Amino acid sequence: MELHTLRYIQTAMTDPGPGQPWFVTVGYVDGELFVHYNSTARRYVPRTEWIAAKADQQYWDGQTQIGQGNEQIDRENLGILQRRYNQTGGSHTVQWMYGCDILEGGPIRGYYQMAYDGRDFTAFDKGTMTFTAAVPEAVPTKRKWEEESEPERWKNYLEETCVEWLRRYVEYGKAELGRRERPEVRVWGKEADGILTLSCRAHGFYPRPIVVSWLKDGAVRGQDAHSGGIVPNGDGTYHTWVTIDAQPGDGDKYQCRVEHASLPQPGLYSW
C-alpha cells in the first residue's frame, strides 16, 4: 500500500534564546523537511530541490502570509496562556502539529493538536467534530473554538486542502521521495575492562526505516545489545548504530545484519 504524509509543526518560544528565532514552523512530506518559516526571515523558504523547482512565487507568497499570520497568533497565544495559568514570566513554549495521511490516494487520518510547555493542551477529534481539552485550563479554549465552528473549518482543511496539496507534493517529489540509497556499514570492536564491545554503524541510508541486528554464530542475539535508534545526517540520509557486549577475542562469532529497502537480502558484516 502506498502511504504518504503531510505534517506541519510549529514552535513558539519565550526563550529561544540567544540569537535564535522565537517562532519556527516547518513542514514534512513523507518525513522529509521541505518548507521552513521563522520569525527572523519572516518568509517561507524551500528545503528540498523538488519544491524549489516546482513551486512558483505565488506559492511562497501565499504561504508567507499564513506564516506571518501564525507568528502573530502565537505571539498572542503565548501571552494569553501565561495569564490563564497565572504566570508572570519565565520560559514557555507553544507547539502545534497538524496534517494528514493518505493511503492509495485517499485520506486515512487528519490531526490538529497543540501543547503548552511540552504537554497536551487541546486536540481536534475530527470524528466527533469536537476539541478535546487535555487540562482544565483548556476548557475555555475548547468551548470558544466549537462555538465559532472551528471543527468545520479544520475538517475542511484536513480532508480537502491538506489532501489536495499532499497529492501535489508527492507528484513534485516522487523521484526523490521514492529513492533508495545503500548504507555504508562498518563494524568496529573495542576491548576494555574485560568486555569486547562490538559496534555496527550504517552510514547514509534512505529511506529512514531500517533494522540492524547482531547475530552470534548465525543466531539472532538481542541480549546485550543497545541501539542508538535512527538519527539524521545533514543531507537527507540517515544513520544508526547498534552495539553488543562480547567476550575478549570472540569477535569472529558475531555478524551485523542489516535489513533495508535498498538491500534485496539482509546485509551481513564482520569485524
Binding site: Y8, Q10, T25, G27, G62, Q63, I66, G67, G69, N70, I73, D74, E76, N77, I80, L81, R84, W96, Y98, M114, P140, T141, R143, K144, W145, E150, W154, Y157, T161, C162, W165
Partner: peptide
C-alpha cells in the same frame, strides 16, 4: 499548504 492555527482563551 499551511493554515492559520487557533487563538487561545
Amino acid at each position: 499548504a499551511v493554515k492559520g492555527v487557533g487563538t487561545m482563551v
